[PDB]
Design a protein around this nucleic acid. Structure first.
Ligand SMILES: *P(=O)(O)OP(=O)(O)OP(=O)(O)OC[C@H]1O[C@@H](N2CN(C)c3c2nc(N)[nH]c3=O)[C@H](O)[C@@H]1O
Ligand SMILES: C[S@@+](CC[C@H](N)C(=O)[O-])C[C@H]1O[C@@H](n2cnc3c(N)ncnc32)[C@H](O)[C@@H]1O
Lengths: 695, 171
RNA sequence: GAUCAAAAAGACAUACAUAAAGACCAGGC
């Protein structure tokens, strides 16, 4: 084998795609006989249906030449012989992250910036939308680190992998906020085994993923499944066949319409593996088989890459689910599922077949040259790839990856990190107390439409996230120390929030159970994205998505993070309908005022914050002729029905201008409260004032 | 139980403290040395109420320190066996709930919990809920316990309580 | 498929605790 007739190593990669599948998506009646059960075949030498016999025998022979070689001698020759080996993981936890960095460049950012069929981005970082993704068989989540690092918090990841030495090392995400990721191990959630091949893990994960994606599914799935086949490397395809099927079935289970899929595979000689690729070609707008230069040249590792999940894939999903049940029934028997599509159907698509053969034979030819090159670099130890450092620098430049070492974050103290995150904003802005709402200050809530309101359940605090459980709170006074938060919860680094701590009582009296929860009032920085200058509702839109991003529903032992329910001030009437007199554990049987949330939980309210969302000289009126709200500039006298950019109240104006209507003793806000103090504003006084000033 | 008593102390002043602010330093030295401490004789010294009298300083022979006897009024906490006090179960440990009576910790053995209060690990926040449910007995709840015994290990006192009598438990 | 560590200056690791007691004998000022 002349390996010296190889093309000069390059950072420029070419993609060949399958043609566009012109056949309809197979239905339950068409697929009804496609599942052929035969004898368990553990022979790869005669799998010539989609590759020339001479090339198949040549690549198998070139693999088996290493069976007599010391693994450390092979590994050292391979490290000298591979032009791309100096890329490694760069600053990421492993070299798998760099495969996703490479492929997300080669595929036009379709994973990190997915598009509709009109080429428009499906996720905009300024709008309330998150990039949902999934990562399966993916421990320790190197692929996930690149995606989370690339999109910061504007992404939410869902993970499933086998429990054990190869579980998710979320602690080792030095470049990404691990709080934006949620591992789920199938049946039982956090306590499951994570077996992708097992159907129950697939089902529980499937329901969980759809629920955590507004019942739409993820924008894309990544799948990097593989296990050790030490001393059986030639049988890697046949051994991994059920894992390949379960990753493809997972794509059809949780990827949204128009979504994308990427899966690791090995060899694709068997009619079983080719029939699985044919089903993906039916189910997606475009499919390709691709080996990135970050994959080692001498191994069978390649990726199937699928773009645009079609509508009507349900029958193919439910077929592959039945085939997985059949494979599980045939475990440890002399029988196996040998076909999932008939050979006559696959070979009837000549355009699919001509791509499949050409993809296999091209891969075999390159793998044979790369195996012969490693063998020569074992025999002669003076051989080296001189361009490895040049090629590395060009690949990192091309893919937009900074050339920096993996450094454990740095440990910043919460005070120094707060000064970094505020970027020279005056610290005194964080010390401002709310104006109390009283009969003397009631006029300040004019004009009513400029305001939002929310029910408070504790004193307001600042909260900083330094990563994982390194969460600290501060009470806004320059004299006060940052205090470590004693709650079982996790937050991405570079997070700065305005919060309160609210205990959520469940039930009443002796049976009552109260759980404290983090309640976000407003947001400044979300995983290194500054949002302080965005409109209060717009900042809250980013805040609401963030709570889901850091959510952990498989972990009922964790303390919840929530966003406060924000009301329009002209709709404060809707708050009092959620006030109830409940028997709290320890109140000697005396009912206490309780605000009931969106779930079956309540807290004791302390009062109501009133926050200005419109900046001076602007204010919001209501046009009686147009039946629409409008912005009015008090200085220029201009009027518009669109939001002026200079009318936006940033965080510092919202925080400084805030009022607080305290709900202590003598204040009537629910009809069961007696007696009322005449010097204190009731619900009726505040609602009457609001009604007079709506018009 | 909380008490208001008269206590004494000897303040040993390092020679640097002398000079102008001498009497003031004694009071500040006193506040720092007794507040937060605990003893078996009087228990936890919660705070110094008033300083009645400052004794004339006597040079101690052979050492720099000069000792000022000090009479002061303080608030102390000294528990007794059989007394009922309201406690919060900081830790619902399976072996027993850990209840902090003010500044003093108190352990209620599981064996001293009525048999109707089964321990429930599977509940979201762990708790010894009553078998049907009825009383969760979890974190932040207010309970009534009877101190069965006290101990003092390294100036710190801790107690053991029981829930066997009637009208004890959840509040 | 992912990953693939070298034994951290030893301080009688410290009281040099060999220094039996007990006795008689010799000498010193
Ligand atoms: P990966 O495990 O699929 O492949 P990798 O990138 O790690 O490279 P490597 O295993 O070292 O070798 C590349 C290909 O050769 C096969 N091997 C490895 N190996 C130790 C071995 C192989 N084949 C035979 N017949 N005998 C052997 O002792 C790997 O599986 C890769 O395909
Ligand atoms: C080498 S990893 C891929 C790397 C990963 N993409 C990353 O970037 O870190 C392959 C993973 O597949 C997992 N795996 C293999 N079989 C599995 C199964 N039946 N169910 C779930 N995970 C499986 C393995 O545990 C392994 O962690």
């Amino acid at each position: 084998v002349d390996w010296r007739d190889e093309p000069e190593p390059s950072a420029c990669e070419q993609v060949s795609w399958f043609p566009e599948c012109t056949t309809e998506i197979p239905d339950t009646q068409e697929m009804s006989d496609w599942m052929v059960v035969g004898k368990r075949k553990m022979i790869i030498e005669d799998e010539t249906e989609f590759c020339g016999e001479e090339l198949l025998h040549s690549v198998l022979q070139c693999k088996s030449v290493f069976d007599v070689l010391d693994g450390e001698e092979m590994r050292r020759a391979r490290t000298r012989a591979n032009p791309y080996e100096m890329i490694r993981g760069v600053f990421f936890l492993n070299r798998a992250a760099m495969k996703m960095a490479n492929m997300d460049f080669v595929f036009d950012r379709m994973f990190t910036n997915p598009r509709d069929s009109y080429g428009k981005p499906l996720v905009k970082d300024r709008e309330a939308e998150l990039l949902y993704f999934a990562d399966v068989c993916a421990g320790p989540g190197g692929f996930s680190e690149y995606v989370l690092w690339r999109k910061k918090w504007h992404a939410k990841g869902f993970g499933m992998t086998l429990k054990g030495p190869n579980d998710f090392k979320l602690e080792d995400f030095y470049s990404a906020s691990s709080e934006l990721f949620e591992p789920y191990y199938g049946e039982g959630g956090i306590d499951g085994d994570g077996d992708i091949t097992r159907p129950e893990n697939i089902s529980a994960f499937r329901n969980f993923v759809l629920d955590n994606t507004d019942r739409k599914g993820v924008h894309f799935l990544m799948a990097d499944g593989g296990f050790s086949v030490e001393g059986q490397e030639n049988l890697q395809e046949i051994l991994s066949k059920q894992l390949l099927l379960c990753q493809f079935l997972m794509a059809l289970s949780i990827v949204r319409t128009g979504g994308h899929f990427i899966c690791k595979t090995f060899d694709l000689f068997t009619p079983f593996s080719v029939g699985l690729v044919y089903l993906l070609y039916c189910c997606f707008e475009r499919v390709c088989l691709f080996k990135p230069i970050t994959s080692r040249p001498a191994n069978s590792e390649r990726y199937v890459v699928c773009k645009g999940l079609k509508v009507g894939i349900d029958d193919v999903r439910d077929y592959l689910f039945a085939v997985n049940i059949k494979l599980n029934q045939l475990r440890n028997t002399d029988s196996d599922v040998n076909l999932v599509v008939p050979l006559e159907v696959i070979k009837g698509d000549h355009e699919f077949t001509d791509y499949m053969i050409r993809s296999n034979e091209s891969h075999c030819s390159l793998q044979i040259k790369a195996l012969a090159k490693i063998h020569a670099f074992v025999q002669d130890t003076t051989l080296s790839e001189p361009r490895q450092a040049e090629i590395r620098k060009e690949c990192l430049r091309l893919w937009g990856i900074p050339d920096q070492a993996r450094v454990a974050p740095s440990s910043s103290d919460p005070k120094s990190k707060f000064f970094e995150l505020i970027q020279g904003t005056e610290i005194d802005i964080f010390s401002y107390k709310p104006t109390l709402l009283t009969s003397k200050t009631l006029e300040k809530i004019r004009p009513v439409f400029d305001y939002r309101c929310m029910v408070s359940g504790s004193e307001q605090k600042f909260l900083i996230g330094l990563g994982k459980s390194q969460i600290y709170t501060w009470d806004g006074r320059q004299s006060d120390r940052w205090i470590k938060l004693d709650l079982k919860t996790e937050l991405p680094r570079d997070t700065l929030l305005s919060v309160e701590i609210v205990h959520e009582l469940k039930g009443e009296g002796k049976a009552q159970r109260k759980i404290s929860a983090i309640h976000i009032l407003d947001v400044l920085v979300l995983n290194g994205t500054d949002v302080r200058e965005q409109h209060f509702n717009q900042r809250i839109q980013l805040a609401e998505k963030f709570v889901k991003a850091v959510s952990k529903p498989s972990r009922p032992d964790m303390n919840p993070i929530r966003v406060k329910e924000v009301y329009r001030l002209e709709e404060m009437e809707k708050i009092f309908v959620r006030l109830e007199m409940k028997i709290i554990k320890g109140s000697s049987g005396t009912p206490k005022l309780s605000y009931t949330g969106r779930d079956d939980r309540h807290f004791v309210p302390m009062g109501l914050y009133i926050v200005r969302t419109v900046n001076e000289p602007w204010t919001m009126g209501f046009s009686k002729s147009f039946k629409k709200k409008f912005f009015y500039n008090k200085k220029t006298k201009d009027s518009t029905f669109d939001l002026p950019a200079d009318s936006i109240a940033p965080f510092h104006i919202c925080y400084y201008g805030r009022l607080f209507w305290e709900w202590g003793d003598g204040i009537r806000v629910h009809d069961s409260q007696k007696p009322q103090d005449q010097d204190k504003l009731s619900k009726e006084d505040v609602l009457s004032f609001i009604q007079m000033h709506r018009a | 139980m909380f008490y208001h008593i008269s206590l004494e102390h000897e303040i040993l002043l390092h020679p640097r403290y002398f000079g102008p602010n001498l009497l003031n330093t004694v009071k500040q030295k006193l506040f720092t040395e007794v507040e937060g401490t605990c003893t078996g004789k009087y228990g936890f010294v919660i705070a110094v109420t008033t300083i009645d009298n400052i004794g004339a300083g006597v040079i101690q022979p052979g050492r720099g320190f000069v000792l000022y006897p000090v009479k002061y009024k303080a608030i102390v906490f000294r528990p007794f066996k059989g007394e009922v006090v309201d406690a919060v179960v900081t830790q619902v440990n399976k072996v027993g709930l850990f209840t902090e009576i003010g500044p003093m910790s108190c352990f209620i053995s599981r064996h001293s919990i009525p048999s109707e209060m089964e321990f429930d690990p599977n509940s979201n926040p762990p708790c010894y809920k009553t078998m049907d449910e009825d009383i969760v007995i979890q974190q932040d709840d207010e309970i009534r316990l009877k101190i069965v015994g006290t101990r003092v290990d390294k100036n710190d006192i801790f107690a053991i309580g029981s829930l066997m009598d009637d009208y004890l438990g959840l509040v």
